[PDB]
Amino acid sequence: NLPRVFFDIRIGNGDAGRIVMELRSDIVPRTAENFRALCTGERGFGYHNCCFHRVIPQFMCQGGDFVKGDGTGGKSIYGRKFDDENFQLRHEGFGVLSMANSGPNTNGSQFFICTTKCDWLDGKHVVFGRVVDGQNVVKKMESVGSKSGKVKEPVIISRCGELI
């Protein structure tokens, strides 16, 4: 079955709710496993207490830099970087989960959730899942976002893991 994982989000001084994501292990098993393992922290590191460092309302939110905390870092379960697995899945609309990168074959831990059909990103970023619940929580993050992407208050992954 396809893994189901979650983030509990805190925006500034308030709990925002839970984002639930389904990971497409049927299409991108390596990329899905990286994300799932970073959610559970099973390898000794992951998204626990990490932040979203970019929030652009009506475009996307980006997070997952647990090494440097600012979007300049991160690491995968496979090492500092790993190859683009495939580009079989498209950025089809709200809630699509995809890997941030600095060019071909530079996947680490950083990821983004699109809040629109970011189809111009197809063939550049590996899509590996989708938000299936807590779309409202992703949308709540816009309250501290901006057109530039600068985040006004901390958006923290307070808790993360895998669900049955």
Side-chain angles (χ1 to χ4, degrees):
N1 305 66
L2 308 182
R4 234 97 171 188
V5 294
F6 74 88
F7 296 151
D8 287 328
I9 301 298
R10 193 172 173 81
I11 300 165
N13 72 338
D15 289 349
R18 178 171 291 195
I19 301 166
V20 183
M21 295 149 286
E22 175 179 73
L23 311 181
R24 293 298 302 276
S25 63
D26 61 323
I27 305 306
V28 279
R30 291 189 82 236
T31 306
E33 175 58 23
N34 183 57
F35 193 83
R36 188 205 66 79
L38 294 172
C39 284
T40 64
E42 67 160 33
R43 312 297 173 101
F45 50 94
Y47 296 133
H48 179 61
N49 278 315
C50 193
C51 75
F52 284 77
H53 63 274
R54 308 186 75 195
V55 176
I56 307 154
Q58 275 61 238
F59 170 37
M60 69 156 205
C61 58
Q62 187 174 331
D65 180 3
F66 61 81
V67 315
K68 289 161 190 165
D70 62 9
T72 62
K75 70 168 178 188
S76 84
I77 65 163
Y78 308 116
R80 282 164 177 268
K81 58 181 185 179
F82 70 105
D83 286 357
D84 294 319
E85 190 166 11
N86 63 63
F87 298 89
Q88 293 177 50
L89 295 161
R90 303 190 72 78
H91 298 79
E92 296 208 333
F94 187 101
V96 71
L97 183 57
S98 183
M99 293 305 286
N101 66 54
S102 66
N105 304 311
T106 57
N107 303 288
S109 54
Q110 284 186 57
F111 64 89
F112 61 95
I113 302 165
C114 286
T115 54
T116 189
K117 190 176 180 288
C118 54
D119 62 347
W120 53 92
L121 298 183
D122 289 350
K124 287 180 185 185
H125 295 95
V126 176
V127 174
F128 65 92
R130 192 154 210 198
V131 175
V132 295
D133 195 37
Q135 293 91 344
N136 64 307
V137 181
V138 179
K139 289 162 191 185
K140 280 185 198 189
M141 289 163 43
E142 296 187 12
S143 65
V144 298
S146 64
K147 297 186 180 171
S148 77
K150 180 191 172 183
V151 179
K152 301 176 184 193
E153 299 191 24
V155 183
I156 308 296
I157 303 171
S158 286
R159 190 146 131 248
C160 48
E162 180 175 21
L163 294 161
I164 301 172

